Design a protein around this ligand. Structure first.
Ligand SMILES: Cc1cc2nc3c(=O)[nH]c(=O)nc-3n(C[C@H](O)[C@H](O)[C@H](O)COP(=O)(O)OP(=O)(O)OC[C@H]3O[C@@H](n4cnc5c(N)ncnc54)[C@H](O)[C@@H]3O)c2cc1C
Ligand SMILES: Cc1cc2nc3c(=O)[nH]c(=O)nc-3n(C[C@H](O)[C@H](O)[C@H](O)COP(=O)(O)OP(=O)(O)OC[C@H]3O[C@@H](n4cnc5c(N)ncnc54)[C@H](O)[C@@H]3O)c2cc1C
Ligand SMILES: Cc1cc2nc3c(=O)[nH]c(=O)nc-3n(C[C@H](O)[C@H](O)[C@H](O)COP(=O)(O)OP(=O)(O)OC[C@H]3O[C@@H](n4cnc5c(N)ncnc54)[C@H](O)[C@@H]3O)c2cc1C
Ligand SMILES: CC(C)=CCC/C(C)=C\CC/C(C)=C/CC/C(C)=C/CC/C(C)=C/CC/C(C)=C/CC/C(C)=C\CC1=C(C)C(=O)c2ccccc2C1=O
Ligand code: SF4
Ligand code: SF4
Lengths: 282, 336, 92, 438
């Protein structure tokens, strides 16, 4: 059997976290926090890996004390255990500080079940969409980083090596990853299941294993605002786009078509199209 | 002293030709080195047989070029790049590392920054130098483009910053300037191959709708699915994906994987075509992170015109096939 | 346009593959119905009678239940959305 | 594996959680099935929740909810406002013994029912959110033996099922009760906005301070002649402004029930109070209020099945006591099932005691009293069409000083009241409503 660990993050529901122009702020109060939607695909893949190969899946979150409800929503997928890294020693952490906590969080999981055969993260969180925790976690363990996974082909549990289909910008590519690996799952991998009641009822009366900074044995100031190299100095909402102008009208039946290409070339961004160079460069 | 403030820019090359973001960051670091005291813009480049672009970087504004040489660096393996891009950071000790926010760039920078134990901001749009401690103010969009958070790394070195492709501006290639090209013939030895690339599937085999440079989308002004072939004629012309609205997906015209908006996919192209979309707030919350929004619909009192950059009031079956007709005769006059 | 400004304030988990508002017979809405009370009494502008049929924008449904009751002919197959779907009222 | 429980309470509103609180405090394996993400996620209420039906459920209710964010701005003043064309007749009643012995709190039901779920969870009940009940699993006797859900392996077994699912009696009709659906005269479309008003304008426009609240009840011609009782409640850092009108009146007027809330926001008095704090709407809600009552309620009992709250149409909407009736109906159903569990019988012989407790208490006596209340209001269309706008122009003429010698304002008021309605219409309408108030 394999050992899967799914690092999930409790993220505010950013479909509802919207911009209020009159206060010039994010009105995110009252909006409940959910799983990161890139991580619901990671949890559904882990539940698929549990019913196909019997892999003991853990789920770990370094977050606030209100993030134990995200860890209970991960047990609704059918997972074995949830692990909470809850301490305000970990508050205000950046990616290097999160990964240092998550490396020592998964290292204590390794003292329970064995060496972790697969680490599933999401492609991005939505609050602070950096996406560097997954890449960062493959470097602490020295594992194979398969990022931006769109498909899973052969997950050979005997050869301890699986074939993913990583998305890049020039195109997808099949990659023979060598387990132990750290995957990083996109939205396009699968669609997460509607959870059954015996797992959802078990998810309600479940208490995730809470580990403080004394429980892990890490450095006390390598995890919070002190183990954070970067510092967020100011957060500010963007502007109100930019008022446009009806280039053409309802009269011009087509003469509006070249008036579009007339006014395209006044913009800087048409250099970036990679297919409008024969009308810009010439 | 002066050569310890040595700002790096990684060059993303795809076989033989570099990514365009490699020269938008070289030009941006010139504006960073103009406000940084006693600094120079390097360029880190990995592979063999890329002198046709290592000289191109110096024409774009690279002061020097660190041209790391190995045969196994022409393909992209982040396991191999990280082993070389932390030896070339421990040796030369840079101040500002800059990679573009391509999918290889964001994946590589996360592996690199936690070997150096430094600070890294991803998909930045607002790089600037503060005059107090000469620090880089890396402004990046968070919350899907709803908070431009400004993040500063005070003391850890290098201040790595993954930068979004397209927000910076290019310098023109000038053959007047030259610079030293440092070749470090990199050795790996026994390397214990983890990542093994089998194939390379083209990007148009699936629906991208976030990594497409052009998204032409429509709904309810695209009468039937017959008009969405007219939108796909403009999609594959511009090398981009065709999107949709909820009023097109719910009518069964395209698959729900083509839906753009709040409960669909948030696009970030450089050119969005709101072809027949009214522009409700649930739809335009997925397109507001784009660069150009073109709106073609028959109602002049539409809420898409309050977000559009180019606005056309007119029919869709008489403008969009009449735009891809004109775009074919201009794309072929400079093809041959 | 007007009320979808205010429906943007609400929180939804939309179930797009499972429309919970189905109309049982579209022909009753064309000739048998005179005033269309599902359109004029829907607090979320879900129903819009085009000449192409009835456009049921079920994604903005506030799950009140007015449409099922105000419809004189009973041809609205009205369900609640599934669990964890539909409106999710914060400070309701 | 069978998911076995003692009682399954469908719904986690006021009647669902109060029924589950008494069963879980008395040691019953009671499960609550709620179709929302959390309890309170589908619940709409303007907010005035009375503390006496909850002090029968929880005798230490005001100590537990003081530290939390369940309750919101203790109601010390209850106003009734008669909106005119430009004026308002405020008829308030502020009481200061409600500051230390509270009568009612304003609530926001996603904040209240999420806290109330936490007390029911601490009592020992398993609250199962994100789960919609579709039908009932039945034994071969043909009675309700549990609950089937929309979940894949979802089949909860229970000795009794409490249908506390509110208005839209979809699940009540599956149990054999509610032989027909709701007609559009048993319900009222209630459209509500929660507006963010920043904690000190709430103090100024309501005349209160420091977690003391005021409730406005708005009558006038904003409701287009239909009997709509709007409201305007003081939350802590907010104002919940809404309006509710009957579906029979709304169907034959065809005017899009958020327009009544736009007529209520754009009144000259409400736009004077909240000047430009009207358009920072935080949320937009819509629900139904059961208003048929005694003539339209189902059989509230059956074989292993009870019905509470709005599902039994127990709402006194003219006094705005629906949560008062719901939290009590949960207490009466849970005390009925606790009689049913010591005897082991759950048929209509023992579960008819719930219908006996429902009329020995205030719930059905308030329904018999205002039984022919809305059919009385439907056959006038005067008490909200001329009567507020005439009482505003009369009291404006009474207070206007323009050199008119006070007999020619006592007769201009008589020339005002006996011009829009005759004296055979005024003296008739005072006691024609007297039959509605009993
Ligand atoms: C406005 C703002 C801007 C920020 N900018 C930066 C920045 O530029 N650089 C930076 O390093 N930090 C930044 N942070 C903080 C940063 O989010 C935290 O360090 C956090 O640990 C990383 O989350 P992320 O947004 O980077 O998510 P990602 O790293 O993109 O998330 C990827 C995956 O990693 C896993 N994961 C993420 N977070 C956790 C966690 N806490 N516990 C367990 N698993 C987890 C999940 O599987 C998730 O899907 C910012 C925060 C804010 C509020
Ligand atoms: C919770 C929720 C989530 C939602 N999520 C999404 C989402 O992710 N994505 C999304 O798209 N919507 C979403 N919506 C729906 C959104 O609110 C709008 O209702 C929807 O986008 C309307 O689609 P439309 O503009 O294509 O249709 P319409 O609003 O009907 O647009 C028709 C437009 O086309 C014009 N037109 C008509 N004929 C022609 C012609 N011949 N040529 C050109 N133009 C013509 C008309 O003048 C009009 O401007 C969501 C709604 C809710 C409630
Ligand atoms: C605008 C407005 C203002 C009001 N103001 C007041 C006031 O000031 N004072 C007052 O006393 N009353 C007021 N009421 C009335 C009050 O809201 C109700 O009468 C009462 O609270 C309803 O209680 P309930 O137990 O039926 O819960 P409901 O909220 O009616 O519903 C119970 C729960 O059942 C769940 N449910 C429904 N169907 C299913 C299913 N199939 N499966 C699973 N779960 C299901 C729902 O999610 C819901 O949360 C107001 C009502 C409205 C609409
Ligand atoms: C000297 C003295 C006589 C001055 C008169 C002042 C007078 C206006 C009030 C006190 C007089 C007393 C003795 C009259 C006895 C009967 C009273 C209680 C009748 C109630 C009707 C009105 C006038 C109540 C006052 C306004 C305000 C406090 C209401 C609170 C808002 C909500 C909770 C109530 C809703 C509500 C409304 C709006 C009704 O119209 C209605 C009509 C008939 C029965 C009940 C109701 C009702 O409950
Ligand atoms: S009410 Fe019934 S009939 Fe009239 S339109 Fe709506 S659905 Fe068709
Ligand atoms: S439920 Fe309320 S909102 Fe949803 S459609 Fe019927 S009426 Fe419109």
């Amino acid at each position: 059997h394999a050992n899967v660990v799914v690092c999930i993050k409790q993220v505010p529901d950013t479909t509802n976290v919207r911009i209020d122009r009159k206060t010039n702020n994010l009105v995110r109060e009252g909006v409940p926090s959910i799983i990161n939607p890139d991580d619901e695909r990671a949890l559904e893949l882990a539940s698929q890996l549990k019913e196909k190969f019997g892999a003991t899946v853990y789920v770990i979150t370094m977050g606030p004390p209100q993030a134990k409800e995200a860890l209970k929503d991960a047990i609704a997928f059918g997972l074995d255990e949830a692990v909470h890294l809850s301490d305000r020693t970990f508050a205000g952490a950046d990616t290097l500080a999160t990964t240092y906590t998550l490396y020592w969080g998964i290292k204590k999981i390794e003292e329970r079940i064995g060496k972790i055969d697969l680490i599933l993260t999401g492609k991005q969180a939505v609050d602070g969409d950096t996406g560097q925790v997954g890449p960062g976690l493959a470097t602490r363990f020295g594992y194979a980083l398969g990022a931006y996974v769109v498909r899973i082909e052969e997950i050979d549990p005997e050869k301890k090596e699986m074939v993913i289909v990583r998305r890049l910008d020039q195109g997808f590519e099949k990659i023979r990853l060598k387990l132990p690996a750290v995957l990083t799952i996109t939205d396009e991998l699968n669609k997460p299941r509607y959870a059954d009641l015996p797992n959802l009822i078990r998810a309600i009366r479940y208490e995730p294993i809470v580990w403080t900074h004394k429980d892990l044995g890490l450095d006390p100031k390598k995890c919070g605002f002190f183990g954070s190299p970067t510092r967020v100095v100011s957060t500010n909402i963007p502007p109100a786009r930019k008022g446009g102008d009806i280039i053409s009208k309802n009269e011009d039946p087509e003469v509006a078509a070249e008036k579009l290409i007339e006014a395209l070339k006044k913009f800087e961004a048409v250099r970036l199209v990679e297919a409008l160079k024969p009308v810009l460069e010439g | 002293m002066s050569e310890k403030k040595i700002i790096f820019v990684l060059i993303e090359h795809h076989g033989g030709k570099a990514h365009p973001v490699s020269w938008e960051l070289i030009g941006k670091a010139r504006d960073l080195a103009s406000k940084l005291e006693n600094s120079e813009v390097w360029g880190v480049l990995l592979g063999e047989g890329l002198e046709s672009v290592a000289k191109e970087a110096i024409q774009r504004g690279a002061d020097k070029v660190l041209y790391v040489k190995n045969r196994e660096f022409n393909t992209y393996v982040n396991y191999l790049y990280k082993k070389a891009l932390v030896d070339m950071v421990r040796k030369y000790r840079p101040e500002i590392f800059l990679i573009g926010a391509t999918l290889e760039g964001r994946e590589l920078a996360g592996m690199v920054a936690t070997e150096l134990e430094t600070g890294l901001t991803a998909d930045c749009t607002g790089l600037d130098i503060i005059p107090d401690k000469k620090l880089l103010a890396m402004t990046r969009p968070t919350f899907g483009g709803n908070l431009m958070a400004t993040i500063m790394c005070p003391d850890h070195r290098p201040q790595m910053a993954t930068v979004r492709p397209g927000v910076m501006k290019e310098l023109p290639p000038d053959p007047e300037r030259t610079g030293e090209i440092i070749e470090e013939e990199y050795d790996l030895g026994t390397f214990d191959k983890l990542i093994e690339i089998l194939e390379t599937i083209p990007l148009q085999t699936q629906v991208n709708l976030e990594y497409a440079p052009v998204v032409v989308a429509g709904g309810k002004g695209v009468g039937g699915p017959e008009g969405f072939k007219k939108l796909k004629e403009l999609a594959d012309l511009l090398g981009g994906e065709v999107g949709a609205s909820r009023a097109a997906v719910k009518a069964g015209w395209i698959s729900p994987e083509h839906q753009v908006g709040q409960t669909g996919k948030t696009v970030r192209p450089v050119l969005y075509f709101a072809c027949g979309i009214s522009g409700a707030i649930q739809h335009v919350v997925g397109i507001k992170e784009s660069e150009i929004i073109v709106a073609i619909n028959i109602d002049e009192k539409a809420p898409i015109f309050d977000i559009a950059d180019i606005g056309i009031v007119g029919d869709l079956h008489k403008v969009v096939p009449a735009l891809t007709a004109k775009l074919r005769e201009l794309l072929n006059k400079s093809g041959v | 346009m007007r009320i979808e400004d205010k429906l943007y304030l609400n929180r939804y988990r939309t179930d797009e593959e499972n429309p919970h508002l189905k109309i049982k017979d579209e022909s009753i809405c064309a000739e048998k119905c005179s005033d269309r009370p599902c359109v004029s009494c829907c607090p979320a502008d879900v129903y819009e009678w085009t000449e192409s049929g009835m456009e049921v924008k079920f994604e903005g449904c506030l799950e009140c239940g007015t449409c099922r009751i105000v419809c004189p002919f009973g041809n609205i197959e009205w369900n609640y959305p599934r669990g964890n779907y539909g409106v999710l009222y914060k400070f309701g | 594996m069978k998911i076995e429980f003692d009682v399954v309470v469908v719904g986690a509103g006021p009647s669902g959680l109060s029924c589950a609180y008494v069963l879980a405090k008395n040691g019953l394996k009671v499960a609550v099935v709620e179709k929302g993400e959390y309890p309170g996620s589908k619940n709409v209420m303007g907010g005035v929740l009375y503390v006496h039906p909850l002090k029968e459920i929880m005798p230490d209710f005001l100590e537990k909810a003081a530290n939390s964010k369940a309750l919101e701005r203790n109601v010390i003043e209850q106003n009734l406002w008669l909106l005119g064309n430009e004026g308002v007749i405020k008829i308030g009643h502020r009481n200061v013994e409600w500051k230390e012995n509270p009568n009612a709190f304003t609530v926001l039901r996603a904040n209240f029912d999420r806290w109330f779920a936490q007390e029911v969870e601490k009592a020992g009940a398993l609250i199962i959110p994100k789960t919609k009940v579709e039908d009932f699993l039945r034994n071969e006797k043909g009675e309700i033996a549990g609950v089937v859900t929309s979940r894949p392996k979802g089949e909860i077994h229970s000795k009794a099922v409490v249908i506390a699912e509110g208005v839209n009696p979809i699940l009540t009709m599956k149990a054999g009760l509610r032989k027909e659906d709701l007609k559009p005269h048993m319900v009222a479309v209630a459209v509500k906005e929660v507006i963010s008003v920043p904690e000190d304008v709430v103090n100024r426009v309501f005349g209160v301070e420091g977690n003391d609240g005021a409730t406005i009840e708005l009558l006038g011609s904003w409701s287009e002649g239909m009997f709509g009782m709007g409201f305007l409640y003081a939350n802590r850092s907010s104002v919940s402004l809404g309006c509710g009108v009957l579906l029979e009146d709304l169907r034959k007027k065809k005017i899009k029930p958020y327009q009544l809330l736009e007529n209520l926001k754009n009144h000259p008095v409400i736009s004077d109070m909240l000047g430009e704090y009207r358009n920072n709407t935080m949320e937009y809600l819509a629900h139904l209020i059961p208003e048929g009552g005694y003539y339209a309620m189902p059989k509230v009992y059956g074989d292993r099945v009870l019905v509470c709250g709005d599902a039994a149409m127990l709402v006194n909407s003219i006094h705005r006591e629906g949560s008062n009736h719901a939290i009590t109906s949960g207490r009466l159903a849970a005390e009925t099932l606790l009689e049913a569990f010591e005897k082991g019988d759950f048929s209509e012989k023992i579960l008819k005691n719930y219908y006996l407790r429902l009329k020995e208490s205030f719930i059905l006596k308030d329904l018999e009293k205002y039984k022919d209340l809305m059919p009385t209001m439907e056959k006038n269309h005067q008490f909200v069409e001329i009567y507020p706008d005439l009482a505003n122009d009369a009291l404006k003429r009474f207070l206007q000083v323009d050199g008119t010698p006070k007999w020619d304002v006592q007769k201009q008021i008589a020339d005002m009241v006996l011009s829009r309605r005759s004296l055979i219409g005024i003296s008739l309408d005072l006691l024609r409503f007297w039959r509605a108030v009993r």
